[PDB]
Design a protein around this ligand. Sequence first.
Ligand SMILES: CCCCCCCCCCCCCCC(=O)OC[C@H](COP(=O)(O)OCCN)OC(=O)CCCCCCCCCCCCCC
Ligand SMILES: CC(C)CCC[C@@H](C)[C@H]1CC[C@H]2[C@@H]3CC=C4C[C@@H](OC(=O)CCC(=O)O)CC[C@]4(C)[C@H]3CC[C@]12C
Ligand SMILES: CC(C)CCC[C@@H](C)[C@H]1CC[C@H]2[C@@H]3CC=C4C[C@@H](OC(=O)CCC(=O)O)CC[C@]4(C)[C@H]3CC[C@]12C
Ligand SMILES: CC(C)CCC[C@@H](C)[C@H]1CC[C@H]2[C@@H]3CC=C4C[C@@H](OC(=O)CCC(=O)O)CC[C@]4(C)[C@H]3CC[C@]12C
Ligand SMILES: CC(C)CCC[C@@H](C)[C@H]1CC[C@H]2[C@@H]3CC=C4C[C@@H](OC(=O)CCC(=O)O)CC[C@]4(C)[C@H]3CC[C@]12C
Ligand SMILES: C[C@@H](NC(=O)Cc1ccc(C2CC2)cc1)c1ccc(OCC(F)(F)F)cn1
Ligand SMILES: [Ca+2]
Length: 1056
Amino acid sequence: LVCNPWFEHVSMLVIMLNCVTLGMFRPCEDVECGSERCNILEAFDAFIFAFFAVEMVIKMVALGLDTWNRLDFFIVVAGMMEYSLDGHNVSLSAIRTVRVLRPLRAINRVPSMRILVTLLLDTLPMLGNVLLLCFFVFFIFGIVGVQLWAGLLRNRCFLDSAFVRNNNLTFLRPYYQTEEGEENPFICSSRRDNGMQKCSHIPGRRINWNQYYNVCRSGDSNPHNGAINFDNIGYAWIAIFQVITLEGWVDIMYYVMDAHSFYNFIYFILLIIVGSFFMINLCLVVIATQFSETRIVDSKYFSRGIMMAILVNTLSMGVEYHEQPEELTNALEISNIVFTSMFALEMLLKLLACGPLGYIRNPYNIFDGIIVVISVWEIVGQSVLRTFRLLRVLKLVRFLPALRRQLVVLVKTMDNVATFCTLLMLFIFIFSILGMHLFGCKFSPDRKNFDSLLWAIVTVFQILTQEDWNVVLYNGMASTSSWAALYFVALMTFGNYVLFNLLVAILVEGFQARFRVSCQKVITHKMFDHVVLVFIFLNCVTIALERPDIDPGSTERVFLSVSNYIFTAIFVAEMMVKVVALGLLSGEHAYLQSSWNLLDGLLVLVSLVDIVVAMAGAKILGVLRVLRLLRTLRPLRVISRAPGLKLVVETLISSLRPIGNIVLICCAFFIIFGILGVQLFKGKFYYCEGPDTRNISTKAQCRAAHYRWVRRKYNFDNLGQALMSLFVLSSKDGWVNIMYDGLDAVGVDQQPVQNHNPWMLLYFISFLLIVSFFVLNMFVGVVVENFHKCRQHSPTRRSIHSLCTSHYLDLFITFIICVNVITMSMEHYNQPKSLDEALKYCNYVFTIVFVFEAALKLVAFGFRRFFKDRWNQLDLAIVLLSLMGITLEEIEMSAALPINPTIIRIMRVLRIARVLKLLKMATGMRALLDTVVQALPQVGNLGLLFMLLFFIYAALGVELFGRLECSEDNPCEGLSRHATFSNFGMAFLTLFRVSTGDNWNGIMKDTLRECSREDKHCLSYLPALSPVYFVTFVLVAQFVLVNVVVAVLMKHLEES
Ligand SMILES: CCCCCCCCCCCCCCC(=O)OC[C@H](COP(=O)(O)OCCN)OC(=O)CCCCCCCCCCCCCC
Ligand SMILES: CC(C)CCC[C@@H](C)[C@H]1CC[C@H]2[C@@H]3CC=C4C[C@@H](OC(=O)CCC(=O)O)CC[C@]4(C)[C@H]3CC[C@]12C
Ligand SMILES: CC(C)CCC[C@@H](C)[C@H]1CC[C@H]2[C@@H]3CC=C4C[C@@H](OC(=O)CCC(=O)O)CC[C@]4(C)[C@H]3CC[C@]12C
Ligand SMILES: CC(C)CCC[C@@H](C)[C@H]1CC[C@H]2[C@@H]3CC=C4C[C@@H](OC(=O)CCC(=O)O)CC[C@]4(C)[C@H]3CC[C@]12C
Ligand SMILES: CC(C)CCC[C@@H](C)[C@H]1CC[C@H]2[C@@H]3CC=C4C[C@@H](OC(=O)CCC(=O)O)CC[C@]4(C)[C@H]3CC[C@]12C
Ligand SMILES: C[C@@H](NC(=O)Cc1ccc(C2CC2)cc1)c1ccc(OCC(F)(F)F)cn1
Ligand SMILES: [Ca+2]
């Protein structure tokens, strides 16, 4: 019965039959239970439960009263409760949700999955230290947010009560709201605050009703049907968790910048660093560390000749585009006819030399044979085979040993990854059917729905990639309840911060197992670099003041022009003195013998050319524009002057070498999928744009209806457009909307139809899975190389003293503070007055209790001894700060009111420093923080290179996108009043958003859109520089952040 192993196979057979039974559920076709298909299914489910109950009885009898065994016991108990409770209509369907745990049974039946889960479950206990840090991040930022912005997102511009009453008119809506409605609320800034958005910014009517919305008072709803707000701690954590995932965090920021203050970006800049970057990357480091702790034919020319033929053929296949000329299509076919013949000529020649058996011996020779038959078949059969012509690129593996070796390493990576991927699909499946039960046809139908298995799986995969996952969250919260946020918190946490970090650990552990003399003296002088470095810094301020809105006649323009001449002369002399002392190139130690010296050569040379062009009253405007762009690279001279920056930059360029092949393999897949995407989707990404297009089906109908026939910014018309669309997909920002266009595509001059070709999911989801696999191997290749580089390198007083030295006092304080944390979290918007008095009294008790501790501490140790320890100093500061806070509150209560109410609010917010005391108790967390501290010297410079990169691109963006404008005639999808390149300060903040990858694809769209005919000073070739601007910044910015994660990882490994 149980002894025979075949019984386990019988159980595994039933398990799979239960998973298919769960997947056939239809949310609101089975709830009624009026169909015959459901009746057979529920009977099938009942039969399966009988088997499980029968088996469990047998096992219990055989074995009596193994964690997995307990789990199976839990499922049987839960199922019996659901099964036996039938006949009671009270929450019967709700109890039905417990069956989604049945697929978990398969973990124990598969030995490989059981081992991995066991290893995973033995790694969790040491993640607690990172969990304690998460509590601090959420509690600290969740109580400060509530204190500042409680109820400020309910603000709306209302009509004056007297106006409506006296004038006896009630046709207008009570408060201003765009025609879009509550989906885009117009939040105003209260009169006592200084928010950016005021009720006087309301656009006029388009005699004017809008101008009378001139009162900003609290409304009756928060943004997104109440989902986004800071009215209490519960609603604040939903916002904070959304910021930590870097999805929609700008929208939350803009909501408080428009209502409270523009300087609220500090609150979100810190949170993206402390929480989104370090806290989410400390979890990765901990898991990885813990896992580690647990005759003619053979001629060279012939091979080169055949290699060249394949390469030229591949280049030819990528020259197709929409509206292709007939002649170019004919030429391509002839070229295909010749090339396939050439391979066939090679196919015959090798056969003769080695014979039919000899040729079959070589494995590559076998593959070539499979390609010739289909190639000739296509000509003889004179379109599906056309898509197979891309396989010819695989022939090049024969003649690239370096890549051939690299591919083998990647292929051998699948043996270890196979067990995990099987664990991913089970994790996704359980949450796919769990989503159906909760959100089954409640989203009234949105494309992101849980209405069926196919589109519930896609909505769970999409959430894990964190693309529009908040849009799904808002619908889920509104439909069922605000507590539906727990579904997304668990899916995003167990999926992205535990399972994904486990995959990285699997990979890492797998791999891991006379005047000239004066110049000679002056340049060699110690302070020469610091003197020049000062001039360069002043040159950065001049660059940072440049912006489009400078009046040419103003004094500031004159000042900027003069300073430019001064710096150009200064750096010419510095270059001139160096060359004289060292010689241009003839000497062995010549000036141009080092790349850094060469770098300074081009920058100076451009400056002289700039002077000449400025000297020239001629048609040289185009040249003057290019020069203006290159003059933003001047800050690059800081690297050669700072020894720390020079070292790290040379290190980063070193880290690229080990992963060079993977980049080449990754660049090869971009072209192959780009060429494939062009063939499938060229000419089909057009749509009819208009208020109502339900009747439109073709281009002509779009013209007849006087609607516009337009094109998507990201399409696959040609390999140039395909590569720009694929990079956006790989970045996983806006990748969903490109997928929708692929599914909806119908044909040339045809209106796309929703979900026309669902089979296209394979093209897009396959690309994301493959590209994410290569990106993982770039991170591992950097780590493995770094590890290699690292391994090679009085009686009344005595009792008081006993109490203070005893742990009792410390644990008592930790209890008092833990109570304080609870009370501080009880505050919310419009709390009852009785609560205000109760919380005020609770503050009094804490204040005196802290005071007593300081009094006892002073007596036990003495005034000089007590002040020695920094922890005691922190107590003194907070107790002193607490006394100031409470003092001003009472004066505010008193008749005298000289205290500005900003002071009171700031003091209340700052009283959260009491939590820092718990830091002393958390020895584990402090050691974890100590790891980052020890790595600061290696991370501090990478932060200097990060800000230097930001400066060069923030100054470059202003020159490029300085003048772009947003208007109802030329609307912008990513830019707004908050995201602009108007000046250096704003471009710096926009680039910070781009680094996080929050709707950076929308910003790029706004630069690719054509300038208006009437508008002037629009760069013709901007749509070509914009993709280069965003691609390079995105890749360069992320590489620096990757190395900062690795630097902390190495330090952690070497400390344990
Ligand atoms: C340390 C935090 C780390 C994780 C944080 C992730 C985000 C947590 C979000 C999950 C909780 C979801 C509930 C959100 C909420 O406050 O709304 C519930 C409720 C409103 O929903 P009704 O359907 O009842 O609508 C009533 C309308 N009249 O809000 C309330 O009215 C009060 C709810 C209790 C206040 C929150 C205290 C508990 C903290 C949040 C729970 C999550 C814990 C996360 C660890
Ligand atoms: C990268 C390797 C593997 C293959 C080489 C790729 C090229 C063949 C691609 C890259 C850029 C592509 C071009 C990008 C833009 C255009 C313009 C497009 O429209 C025009 O001819 C514009 C006419 C006008 O401006 O009036 C026609 C296709 C073409 C030449 C594309 C044809 C295919 C090109 C040359
Ligand atoms: C190390 C480098 C980056 C030098 C330090 C940075 C400064 C050069 C930047 C940061 C703050 C910037 C300022 C932020 C805000 C403004 C207001 C803004 O004013 C306008 O454009 C006009 C506004 C109006 O007319 O209402 C743009 C210029 C200025 C002074 C910016 C000029 C450039 C500043 C001084
Ligand atoms: C291989 C992976 C990592 C991507 C590499 C970066 C690409 C996304 C960049 C590199 C060069 C870019 C191309 C440079 C120039 C053009 C031509 C441009 O067409 C025009 O010239 C239209 C504007 C005009 O009217 O001048 C359209 C975008 C495109 C194909 C760019 C699309 C984005 C490209 C392919
Ligand atoms: C560590 C903490 C999270 C545990 C203890 C927290 C509770 C004591 C606090 C947290 C926030 C408070 C809630 C914040 C907001 C509301 C809504 C308020 O009005 C409503 O019920 C309407 C809700 C709406 O319209 O949005 C009633 C009090 C209540 C439940 C508060 C009661 C006390 C709560 C649950
Ligand atoms: C999205 C995420 N990427 C990273 O963390 C760096 C990283 C990339 C890739 C891997 C491995 C698994 C493949 C591991 C780590 C981020 C970016 C930018 C940001 O903000 C920037 C700042 F605000 F600091 F300027 C916060 N998180
Ligand atoms: Ca996004």
